[PDB]
């Protein structure tokens, strides 16, 4: 049993080997009982604001939109301690941890962005931080890997598999299965078991209420739409959570396309993926018809997470919110147009969102739409990727 | 069928402990696999607990991790594994054989079809690693109305209400990984194996002195399969030794 | 003539040939006019605010200071959109060359933090970017020479004289020479030609005013001491500023010390140079004996500026202002710590300001001082740099 | 001394026009330096503008900055430069020498000293580039203590007051680079020499013909040393060639 519902519609659950279980039950017991206390919010808030640097701005992009009836704001993550909205849940759940008397940490990481936020939060806080990353992409991110060593975090590579995010993600699960008496599984995403997706919304949620008090103090009204790009779907519930309960505000999460869908080769389970059950939970996966699981190709390091979480595949069931993919070519098109229209280096997770309101804007450019896009994180880390591609292409 | 039920009932007439060997089916090959499996049989292995290749398997250690690294360098698909139960099956009409599965493989293409396919096969048991008794509802339906026994793992601290669960929901026997053994006589649970660890003919005895039913070695006939990868012949005899010893140590 | 004080005490002045006067009478006529404008001070707070990110956080170290009667804080500009505090100035002289009906910028940059500042504005903004940069730094310097350029900025390397920035700051100037009615020197620091360094101040003096706020709110009084790097002296002549006339805080410059002061090789003039005229100013600078002017040498690319603003030597020569210097060494000591202690990330500039307080905390671990580090910039930058050297030490 | 208006007087008694050719002292070497400024004076130009290696020339173009390279790549320092001038002033007692100078040059070791220093070689005047007329005080007056004429550019928009200041702040001559030629005799200023892109015989009568006393090629002739680097021999023979050209056309 448990004290809050462990699934969305048929999305979600708690499928773990029976030994993970008190350490989701006691996880959840303390999670509940951290948000019905002023003080653990008080010293979360105090993180947010004086470390992580919180609030964000909302950033109006009027070179990119003139002469369309669109406005279009970004939601600035990518000025978070850090370089992304990582940072948010990473404290939370840090905080979570000490607050059951818990020294260490345990997380997995893809592009090691949330690696490194782990790192940083653990370094922080003085917890002992262990960082799972499959052996791939350990060697495609050194400089995520060393970020993560001079903040203390021991890095231990996975070879297992296909040594990528879903290897890493098993390996954690794997370890905190023998040590959550004293480590806490610090998850990068809304997904897995109850209750990281619920966990990671809630300590997420600040993107969206900041947005909505930010767009009401600007425009004096709510978005039609806030666009988010969906990798395992921390940024996106992050920024949906606020306005789920506001039925003219469009909840749109994107999908990377990779090369295309057609080709097969992309990252978008939700609307192209099958449901099933792994790492935890019943969602949609990138999966041979087998039932075997597989990765997800994006050129974006960070939208590499097979599967999706649970909440989403279920706002996506009952049309609250609605799911598209852009292709790796759109992503890159939109990294340029911000670098040159703002000069704002957008991530290429970002990107992808971004990308799909360009899409939306230059579709329909007489369309009346205010839109905001959440600017997930900063791009510094993919102007090598970038450089290559466009060198590459002549 | 009652397999499970008709094996505990002869080893209790012989007062005798059940000795189970874990194999991932397909590791190294096909044919190697089936050559590995007859000759536990032969060697005195009471019943069988076999896996399915998966990707992740996420409550698996390295031995097996290897083990399914192998299978599926060999191409080794759950299609296949059935074939090689059935073979298997026609081949050894009364032990019983379970299944170690991931719920995704399960799920896959709907659970009542596998378990239907179970019960095609001839197949005893299926314990899903990753369905804890919390979310086993629609599996353990799906097994009893195939005439599948469904297996839960009984964790160390399985508090009370867990035993209870694990009593009531399982059957063929409880996957145990004194008190234990003991509530679960109490609630009338399927006989407890004891499994994790067990790698050595004095953790046999132990098992069965403890109250349990008997042992089940999850990896150590893995480790042996991985040592011998050069010598298929040397790998055999090695596995017909261990296995023997291991059920010897299981007698009264 | 003039409408403001061209000088600091004997620094400063406007030692340019006779061509760029109107220049600079021009800009410093705009400058005061547009400093009484409050439409043009509401443009520049929007654009700091929902764009930069200001107000950055001033944040409590207090992992770093356990156990000793320091308190420290590091103002956070290593937060500010860019990750360095280059932005705030380059979005009041962007603002600047508008209000002149300027549409095109040069700028000159070392470490390349300046240049992509400049490129950022220039894009937002909608002026043609164009960047001297010494040739041996666009060769050590390709990222930020890519960001320059995907924000859609022209980079021109400098290979004259030793192809460092003292080169780029030639050519600049030579440029602007001959295209002033048109294109504004966007210059990156407090130093220059009268009005670049009191420009530079006021666009850079909102560190210092929210440092006191956030330091009277958090403490209830003010610092003993604010402690910033100083390469050219913008970023701590922006820390200093309020402070200035707060007799009783300490404002502590630190300059680096290279290999060490007694080795030559240093970028310490200010303390250990000789007064010159050079760059359109009369300041401390690194010159032969015989008056040639030489290079700055720091394991930071950013503290290469070979002289230092002349508010600083003025400061300096009064007593108000103390400077010191910390060396390779030791800015690397505090680097590590940082990400260590506090999973913070600075840039090696910033390290010299944190590695001086480190010491003023070490060497009297029973005084009681409350502290505060301008955290310049992010050190991404870095990583490459620390991993190299760390590696090379074994 | 007065070798400015001595010369000035004796060109107005032939109705001339002055050359002024302009060099970097020790470009490409001390020696071949002494050779290139004996050339330019036996081949007629009327004074010499000579400027002193400095590492950071923000006033000037490519062609002097590559000079400048030039020297320093032969160790040329501001002390060789003066024992060069005291060298040319001992074999040309009546061509006016001027100097232009860098400002930290001239203040590194003591405005005073330098122009002191300049006085005792025999210099005649001083155009420091980076000292506009606004920070010009000290220079000007140390200049005049030791017989030294402060020349000073006078830029095309020069307004009024700037007209003036040139007019009254000057001596030897004024650097320009027709109102403004009238404006200047106008306030008395030192004659002016139009300077900037006299690089034609063309251009030298276009000067005198303006109203200004003369022209001073500021770049012209470094490119003819740049160019014949290859062979000092070639270089002099077209120096010569260049400025017997130039001079010839300040002739009336
Ligand atoms: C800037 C940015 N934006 C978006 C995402 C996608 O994840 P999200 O959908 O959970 O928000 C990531 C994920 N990054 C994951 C997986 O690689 C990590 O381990 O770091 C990111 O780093
Ligand atoms: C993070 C950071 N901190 C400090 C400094 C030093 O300059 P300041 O003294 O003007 O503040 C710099 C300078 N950077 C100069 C010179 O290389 C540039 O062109 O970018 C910096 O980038
Ligand atoms: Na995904
Ligand atoms: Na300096």
Not at chain 2, 178 to 198: M, N, R, T, V
Not at chain 2, 203 to 221: E, K
Request: charge should be negative.
């Amino acid at each position: 049993t448990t004290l809050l519902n462990p699934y969305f519609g048929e999305f979600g659950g708690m499928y773990v080997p029976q030994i993970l279980m008190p350490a989701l039950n006691q996880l959840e017991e303390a999670f509940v009982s951290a948000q019905k206390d002023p003080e653990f919010q008080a010293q979360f808030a105090d993180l947010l604001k004086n470390y992580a640097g919180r609030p964000t701005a909302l950033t109006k992009c009027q070179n990119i939109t003139a002469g369309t009836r669109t406005t279009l704001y970004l939601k600035r993550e990518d000025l978070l301690h850090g370089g992304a909205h990582k940072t948010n849940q990473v404290l939370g759940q840090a905080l979570l941890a000490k607050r059951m008397g818990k020294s260490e940490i345990i997380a997995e990481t893809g592009a090691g962005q949330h690696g490194v936020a782990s790192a940083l939060a653990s370094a922080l806080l003085g917890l002992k931080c262990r960082i799972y990353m499959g052996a791939k992409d350990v060697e495609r991110q050194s400089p995520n890997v060393f970020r993560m060593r001079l903040m203390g975090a021991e890095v231990i590579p996975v070879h297992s598999g296909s040594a990528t995010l879903k290897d890493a993600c098993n390996e954690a699960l794997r370890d905190w299965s023998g040590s959550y008496e004293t480590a806490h599984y610090m998850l990068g995403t809304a997904a897995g078991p109850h209750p990281y997706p619920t966990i990671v919304r809630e300590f997420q949620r600040m993107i969206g209420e900041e947005t909505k008090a930010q767009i009401l103090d600007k425009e004096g009204r709510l978005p039609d739409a806030v666009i988010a790009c969906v990798g395992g779907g921390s940024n996106a519930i992050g920024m949906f959570a606020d306005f789920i309960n506001d039925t003219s505000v469009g909840l749109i999460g994107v999908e990377p396309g990779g090369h295309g869908i057609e080709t097969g080769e992309h990252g978008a389970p939700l609307k192209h993926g099958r449901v099933g059950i792994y790492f935890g939970m019943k969602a949609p996966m990138m999966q041979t018809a087998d039932g075997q699981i597989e990765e997800s190709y994006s050129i974006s390091a960070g939208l590499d997470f097979p599967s999706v979480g649970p909440q989403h595949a279920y706002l996506n069931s009952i049309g609250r919110a609605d799911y598209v993919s852009i292709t790796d070519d759109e992503a890159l098109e939109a990294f340029k147009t911000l670098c040159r229209h703002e000069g704002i280096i957008p991530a290429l997770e970002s990107s992808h969102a971004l990308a799909h309101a360009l899409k939306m804007m230059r579709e329909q450019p007489e369309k009346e739409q205010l839109l905001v896009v959440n600017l997930s994180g900063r791009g510094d880390k993919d102007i090598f990727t970038v450089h290559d591609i466009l060198k590459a292409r002549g | 069928m009652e397999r499970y039920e008709n094996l505990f009932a002869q080893l209790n007439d012989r007062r005798e402990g059940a000795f189970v060997p874990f194999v991932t089916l397909g590791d190294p090959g096909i044919e190697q696999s089936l050559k590995i499996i007859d000759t536990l049989i032969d060697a005195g292995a009471d019943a069988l607990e076999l896996g399915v290749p998966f990707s992740d398997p996420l409550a698996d250690g390295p031995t097996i991790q290897n083990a399914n690294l192998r299978a599926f360098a060999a191409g080794v698909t759950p299609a296949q594994c059935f074939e090689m139960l059935a073979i298997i099956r026609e081949k050894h009409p009364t032990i019983p054989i379970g299944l170690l599965m991931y719920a995704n493989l399960v799920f896959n293409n709907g659970i009542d079809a596998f378990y239907a396919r179970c019960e095609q096969v001839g197949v005893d048991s299926v314990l899903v690693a990753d369905v804890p008794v919390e979310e086993s509802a629609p599996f353990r339906q799906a097994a009893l109305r195939h005439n599948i026994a469904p297996i839960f793992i009984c964790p160390p601290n399985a508090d009370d209400d867990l035993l209870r669960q694990v009593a009531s929901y399982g059957r063929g026997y409880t996957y145990l990984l004194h008190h234990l053994i003991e509530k679960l006589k109490e609630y009338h649970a399927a006989p407890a194996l004891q499994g994790f660890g067990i790698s050595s003919p004095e953790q046999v005895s132990a098992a069965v002195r403890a109250g349990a039913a008997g042992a089940i070695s999850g990896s150590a006939i893995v480790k042996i399969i991985e040592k011998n990868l050069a010598s298929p012949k040397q790998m055999l005899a090695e596995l017909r030794s261990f296995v023997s010893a291991m059920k010897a140590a299981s007698r009264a």
